[PDB]
Design an enzyme around this catalytic site. Sequence first.
Site, PDB file in Angstrom:
ATOM      1  CE1 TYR B  66      39.427  16.194   2.290  1.00  0.00           C
ATOM      2  CE2 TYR B  66      41.652  16.014   1.406  1.00  0.00           C
ATOM      3  CZ  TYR B  66      40.750  15.788   2.439  1.00  0.00           C
ATOM      4  OH  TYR B  66      41.161  15.155   3.614  1.00  0.00           O
ATOM      5  CD  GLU B  68      44.060  18.508   2.976  1.00  0.00           C
ATOM      6  OE1 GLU B  68      44.844  19.116   2.211  1.00  0.00           O
ATOM      7  OE2 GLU B  68      44.350  17.418   3.518  1.00  0.00           O
ATOM      8  CG  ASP B 207      30.672  19.504  25.967  1.00  0.00           C
ATOM      9  OD1 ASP B 207      29.871  19.719  25.039  1.00  0.00           O
ATOM     10  OD2 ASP B 207      31.142  18.367  26.182  1.00  0.00           O
ATOM     11  CB  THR B 233      26.415  17.866  19.668  1.00  0.00           C
ATOM     12  OG1 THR B 233      25.193  18.269  20.295  1.00  0.00           O
ATOM     13  CG2 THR B 233      27.246  17.156  20.690  1.00  0.00           C
ATOM     14  CE  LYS B 236      24.664  13.978  21.934  1.00  0.00           C
ATOM     15  NZ  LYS B 236      25.599  13.976  23.128  1.00  0.00           N
ATOM     16  NE  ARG B 242      24.507  11.325  14.145  1.00  0.00           N
ATOM     17  CZ  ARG B 242      24.771  10.208  14.801  1.00  0.00           C
ATOM     18  NH1 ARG B 242      25.892  10.064  15.483  1.00  0.00           N
ATOM     19  NH2 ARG B 242      23.887   9.213  14.768  1.00  0.00           N
TER      20      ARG B 242
END
Lengths: 429, 429, 429, 429
Positions: B66, B68, B207, B233, B236, B242
């Site tokens: 983890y 964070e 974007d 993104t 794509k 992702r």
Amino acid sequence: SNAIESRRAVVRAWGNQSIEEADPEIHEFMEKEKQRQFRGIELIASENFVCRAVMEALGSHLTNKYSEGMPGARYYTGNQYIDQIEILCQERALAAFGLNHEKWGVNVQPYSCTSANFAVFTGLLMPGERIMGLDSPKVSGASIFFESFPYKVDPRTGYIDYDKLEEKALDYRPKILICGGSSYPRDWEFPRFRHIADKCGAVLMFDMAQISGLVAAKESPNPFDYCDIVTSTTHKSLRGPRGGIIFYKRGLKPIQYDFEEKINFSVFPSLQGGPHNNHIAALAIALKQAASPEYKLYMRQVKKNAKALASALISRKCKLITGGTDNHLLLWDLTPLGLTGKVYEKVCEMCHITVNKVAIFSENGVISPGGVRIGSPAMTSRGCLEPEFETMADFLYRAAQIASAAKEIADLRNQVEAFATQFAMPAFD
Amino acid sequence: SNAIESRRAVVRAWGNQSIEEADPEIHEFMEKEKQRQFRGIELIASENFVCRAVMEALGSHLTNKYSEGMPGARYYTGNQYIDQIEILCQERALAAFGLNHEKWGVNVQPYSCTSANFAVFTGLLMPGERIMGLDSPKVSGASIFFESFPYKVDPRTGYIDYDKLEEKALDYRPKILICGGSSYPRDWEFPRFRHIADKCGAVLMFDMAQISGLVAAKESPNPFDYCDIVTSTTHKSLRGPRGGIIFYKRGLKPIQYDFEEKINFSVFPSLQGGPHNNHIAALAIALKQAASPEYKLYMRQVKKNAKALASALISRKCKLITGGTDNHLLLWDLTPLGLTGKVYEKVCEMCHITVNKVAIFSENGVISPGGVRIGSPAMTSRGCLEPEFETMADFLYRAAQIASAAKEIADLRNQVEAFATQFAMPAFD
Amino acid sequence: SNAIESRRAVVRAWGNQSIEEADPEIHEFMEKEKQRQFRGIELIASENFVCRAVMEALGSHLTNKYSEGMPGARYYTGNQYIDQIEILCQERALAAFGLNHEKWGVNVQPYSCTSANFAVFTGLLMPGERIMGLDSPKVSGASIFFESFPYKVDPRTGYIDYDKLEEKALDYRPKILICGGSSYPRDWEFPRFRHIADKCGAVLMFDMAQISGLVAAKESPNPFDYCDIVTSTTHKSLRGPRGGIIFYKRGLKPIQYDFEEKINFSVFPSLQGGPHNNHIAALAIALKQAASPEYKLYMRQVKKNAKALASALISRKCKLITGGTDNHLLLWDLTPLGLTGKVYEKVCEMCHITVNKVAIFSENGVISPGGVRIGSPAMTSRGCLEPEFETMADFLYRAAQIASAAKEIADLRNQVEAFATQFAMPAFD
Amino acid sequence: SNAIESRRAVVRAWGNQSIEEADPEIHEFMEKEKQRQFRGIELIASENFVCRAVMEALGSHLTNKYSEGMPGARYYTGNQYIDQIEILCQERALAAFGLNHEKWGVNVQPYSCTSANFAVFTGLLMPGERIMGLDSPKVSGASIFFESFPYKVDPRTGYIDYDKLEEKALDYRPKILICGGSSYPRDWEFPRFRHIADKCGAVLMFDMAQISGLVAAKESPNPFDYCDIVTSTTHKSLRGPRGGIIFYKRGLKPIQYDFEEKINFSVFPSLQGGPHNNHIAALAIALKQAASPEYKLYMRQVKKNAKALASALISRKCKLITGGTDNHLLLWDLTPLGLTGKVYEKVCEMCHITVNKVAIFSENGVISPGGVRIGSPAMTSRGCLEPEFETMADFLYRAAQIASAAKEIADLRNQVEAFATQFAMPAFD
């Protein structure tokens, strides 16, 4: 066609390279991290080790397909098999928690527990309505767009003060009363929350960030007998991938229940893009294990390893908040020992011991910097039983003993590494 | 210790199972989906095929840790190697787009492009300030919490009407002017946006959902010469996992630039939990490829395969919006052929052809349901050159010809499958 | 009782003193202002002269009774007679505008037209919803708490561009579309606003600040034929006291109408305290006058006096916005003469001529500071006919000739005074 | 000119008519109300009797001049003398409360105390920020546009619980902490509010609706020693006209003070139109009176009359909230006598006694409907001393004895009338 055959060799020469071939530098770092995990003690309460099957799903071909929408009615065609997987994952989610599909629905698309909470709020509230959750002693996204009034544990005892809580909620009248979250080492009294939520007219929500696996194993009290909404993580005690879940009540009320349309539309298209299909199938795999008998044994051992570690620290006169734990984590006040959480954090890391600091209360109610949080799920998955968690408490206390110089660290790191390297690391050797 | 040795065999027997052993049912569905992808034509403009190295990272052990926070200052200790990976991923992100680290910063933690946009808004605006982006002909999360005033392409031509756009932005004065998004098949005129943003006092944001790979290959106009914020993104045209990216201006202005503190804090702790470490290392791998010469060839072929497919449809008297494409996607008005996007979508799927419907304008300005969107990146990664995209246009037109019955589908599906199965599928055989 | 008798003398000694007795300093300032109004030409379009009956009501004992609430349902007791006055005032309002009590309701409590508008927004809309009204070429309370998107006149002509307005309203979709306000010298085309409001789903509101007497006298098109809400002042062309009015549709729709309960509850107790009883009785007197034949003759003279003043400026080659007026006011561009509105403003004041500056457009589209606004109700109430308004045009022009030189002000002031003192001042001698 | 001469007769014929001449129906209702005030006992704590000087100002010609803006900087010209009146009124306000003009500023334009409070919120706070004030046991405009968290008196005692209030304020962190308002019969402890405000970072506001005359007369603790903002009515104990006042700190802090520009701009042009000139001159007269020795004697009698009325009810075994009063009002619990406030309310009205009901607590904590509120300023302005307030207690109790029977009302009404007509009515005969 000879052209088409050479076209295949071009694709394969790119598509079929390994990491070590394709990116030596990333592969070096990923190998150093595998050694770090194998050669250290992992005591951060929210860490765990995923199995190979979960990893195979995480690194599979389902991500190539875009699946905007919910199963059955998808934006994109060609989702026959992705739909099956997500429905199966939904069914397994209901089954893991003994829920009936006529009283509960579930959305498995949230990218994380935080998104899932934010999705609940967006679906159920207008911007600026009142929520009321637990805070640790405008930061969070919920408090930027909603009016939030956190409640607090009693500084004197570590436990929630339910009478003050009923007064506050009755005075403030939130639309959602949230229990769960942060790093609370005791059981939540769901009956009193239900009683409080009923009196002030709030929806009752449980964020089972830290304890979803215990709940599944019937080793923590069952929120679903009392809450209207339950969100969870998927990577902590559950041992699945990253992600979150939203469970919600369905059907007629004790006028139907409203949640399903609103929450689904809030997850998509409002706040997220397409789902992480690889994560959903991985979660299907983890949720099928969360319901096994073997997994119930694991969770019982988590609970017993956390207790054995708590007890060993208690026998060295350590102050633990609430004096122990009902679950998998415990909070350790280091102020008696003249240490801060930050300093202790860095010394443990020098010994391949990972813990994380947390803010705690002193008895009088001032915020102390001397809090550290630890937990058992990670090393329990590596095979550790109770004798090993007592050894680990010995490492922890000795590290604190050292940090009261505020040299001998080499001995401790050597002993921790000699210790940790005795235990398998799931999915590797 | 014999006990410790049997403890290792218990861990391994669970940790080291494969999918086919651990979850036969999920493995069946995942295998049917691999066949579906191999045996069909993938024409959805936002789909692609990740290579094995990207997949190995996606299904690796970095998720057990983890992390964070942001690199260098992490909430949890034990992130030495995860930090290296994320910094390397940041460096590679700047390099892929020819950016200098003294003029640009980058955050690689957004769970998706949507989160990343929402993160930009949260960091830069108070709830309820004015944004202005492009809409397709309170749904989105941005318009729930912010005041949004979408602008529109000229119905008569398909192209943005920049004069009407300058009037609207000057009248409304948004705090952020957003270009990019949806499914726009032509080049954005970044100089006019910069001019418009300057006149009305907005921050200029791009974007690059659909075209990040083209921009990286220097095969689309460069937004970074003109914008203040660029989000993208990662799955794509880039062919990574992702996820989303936020790029932002740094250092002194043409008083310093404000974005960095606000955007980072908005991603965490405001809106997200810990990063998907497996996704970040996968993106490092993809971003190192996005800068290669080989990848520039791939993108040139994407652009050329989209053109060849457009031209073949034009030679059958199909109406394409704006009459063609500058990039990788094209929008096809099926209204002349007496078809709706929904009906055509379902017929193509019956033939192992995946496309998706989109709303379009008729010439007079009414919203038509007869729009379908298609694109070349997926089948280009499978090796298809221009002759194969002409064949695919033949399949597409024949499917439409069939759907003008609003039997012979078996022939088409048989021909599509015989066609598709000639091309390698990256990372498999 | 002697005690009780002497107690009356003490009360009378304080209660019955005149201003001159009790506050000489305020009396001096009030006499100076009475002279100033009498010896000046009042050409501010917003001003008028109340009659003695209105003043006796404004200075009466009704203020002694507190009257929170609406008639027939008041917080306090003792309101038998105050209720009848407010009822009578409501009835007279409906009557003055030809309205039927079971299609229209009315609230006469708003402290001012601004309060009345804000009360409508608070009642009909959620905080943060969209209104759209006319602005002169955050500031207003409406725009602080709601999202306002103002429209503007066509700079080239002075008239509203109803085609650009229909476009804006369809793009922005306001929940309230407001017409009226500022200082538009021409008739609002209510039929187009009704059509625009219908297409975009808005409530149609007319703010009849300036022209409410013209509408009452049937000398201006009737807004109630088309609007859903009509607010108004009470002191401008109506010649009443300060305050505002809210008219709203009642009963069945061409489900019942929503406004009555929402609007009344917004006025009190949300935004205001008790009503000003002295003002409500004063308004009752003015509203009775407004429905009478004599008032219709006054308003006709108001229109003819404004037309005669306009024509006199026009023959001196002044440029008036839109070239004239349909109502009581006109706007004059002083840019050709080489003057600013503020410069001309202060010169006129030296000559006992009150006008006020306004923002106007130039023929291109830039904001000009050379606007001045004047109107006829005040001097028409003092008795002036068309010949006297032509004299006043000569004063105005000669004043402007002086200011282009930037003395002989003294001569012009003395002529204005000799002129102005010819005319009676309502309610004095 | 004969033309000009006859034009004066027409103007005078309309301008100089009395109410009786111009509106017989309104005259009839206004005479009926004058009788009702004279023949009744006015015991509503909010009411008072303005003197003739105040009425002559309220019914004067200043209303004819429009005066948007603040003095010395007005939208219109012609305000030389209106400015001097508003300046004088500002100066007298500062003087009446002992304030120094370079530590305190004042705005006398608010239409009412409610408007004044809302103007402060709009100026000091962003929409949606937190205020915290006292509520009686969404509604108010403050709570529609800002987040309000009201505090309450201790149900068991009638007094404010300053320890629960300090807790709430630290938990909620309001940006404005308001004291004052409703109908608190005791002294506010400003030192504790200042301490609470300091600990939690709030601006301290006192709304002196009810007690502003007592403070002016030095018969109630001085809020200006501690608060940052003080609003007030002008018609209650001050005996002025309807309206409100905003006092605010100026100059250096123990960086300058923020309030002046923010608060003035909120009053105009955000929330209001032009000021009510007739009310501002009236207030100037009242404020001059309020600083005089005679007024100090009136307020002392007001306190002594309320104390004598309280003691008379106390000896009849009435239960008064907190057991008495520090000021001019008292709250009486009619639950023991078996009556509701609303029942008793309407009975008193039949006997020409005006009181008003209020919500109160029972000793446990439930809302009782049996509250009635009464106070002394009105009948003290009519000349009553302590003996007459003891008579009035006898009327009140006898009225309650009648209502417990749920005729002999007639006898009590006739006694109230014979009693009330003994006393002069300010400004009439």
